[PDB]
Design a protein around this ligand. Structure first.
Ligand SMILES: CC(C)(C)n1[nH+]c(-c2ccc(Cl)cc2)c2c(N)ncnc21
Length: 272
């Protein structure tokens, strides 16, 4: 009847550190760690912390800011934050960990092309949302994709997202030209991770050899049992000119319709 209209300028994110409870350590990087815990003892959550004197507390909070502006079912959802050191970033908890570990774990060996292409579609949808919001991820890879119940996949790690050479587009790694298109290149590399059970891209090739090679026009071959049509999509993602590469909007549609429109004769196999 009579709605509250006053006192709404309150920060819908900030919360008291006392309401948090870090339980299990799930991750650890250069600028902090990730823990699983409870938000007010009743909500299981994920908390990304920061290692003191490893990054400006102001810079760290940037990933939090981006996450305040971006909302989508295929993006990890931010729940709350603690902007005062020790700084904490609270988000929904993804039960199956990173896509990378899922792929090379025991439950990954049973995955086949239909599930794998579907996951790519989910990721593409997430990136499509980022795409239309005029943002760039800069670090799209399997290690930065989170998996949840029912194999839902969500883009995470927007630490370096604003308005690793084996995953980075040439122009981006060489001249710092990070765009949604250098992100499309990354998705292409990600597609190889999905079709090889998480194998590292460019097998047997060191970082410096990779740059030389890709500049000389080298591109990874079609993975074993991977339909040539899918490899062709990867090659479109790795086109030299960033503007030749497809949009995530295009990729999302292509993958969602894959098995009826592109690979109608698909038949199961030993690994894909
Ligand atoms: C590294 C790993 C796989 C343990 N990890 N990292 C995050 C994560 C937490 C906060 C932000 Cl802001 C971004 C990602 C995460 C999560 N929510 N749920 C499960 N595992 C997670």
């Amino acid at each position: 009847g009579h709605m509250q209209t006053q006192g709404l300028a309150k920060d819908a994110w900030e919360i008291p550190r006392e309401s948090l409870r870090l339980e299990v350590k799930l991750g650890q990087g250069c600028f902090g760690e990730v823990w699983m815990g409870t938000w007010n003892g009743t909500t299981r959550v994920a908390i990304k912390t920061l290692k003191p004197g490893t990054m400006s507390p102001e810079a760290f909070l940037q990933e939090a800011q981006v996450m305040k502006k971006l909302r989508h079912e295929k993006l990890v959802q931010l729940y709350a934050v603690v902007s005062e050191e020790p700084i904490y970033i609270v988000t929904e908890y993804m039960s199956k960990g990173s896509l990378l570990d899922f792929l090379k774990g025991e439950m990954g060996k049973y995955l086949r092309l239909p599930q794998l292409v579907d996951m790519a579609a989910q990721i593409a949808s997430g990136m499509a949302y980022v795409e239309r919001m005029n943002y760039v991820h800069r670090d799209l890879a399997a290690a930065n994709i989170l998996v949840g119940e029912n194999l839902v996949c969500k883009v995470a790690d927007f630490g370096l997202a604003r308005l690793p050479i084996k995953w980075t587009a040439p122009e981006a790694a060489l001249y710092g030209r990070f765009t949604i298109k250098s992100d499309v290149w990354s998705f292409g590399i990600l597609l190889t991770e999905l079709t090889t059970k998480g194998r590292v891209p460019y097998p047997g090739m060191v970082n410096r050899e990779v740059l030389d090679q890709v500049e000389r026009g080298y591109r990874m071959p079609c993975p074993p049992e991977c339909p040539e049509s899918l490899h062709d999509l990867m090659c479109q993602c790795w086109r030299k000119d960033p503007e030749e590469r497809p949009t995530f909007e295009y990729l999302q549609a292509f993958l969602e319709d894959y098995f009826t429109s592109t690979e109608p004769q698909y038949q199961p196999g030993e690994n894909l």
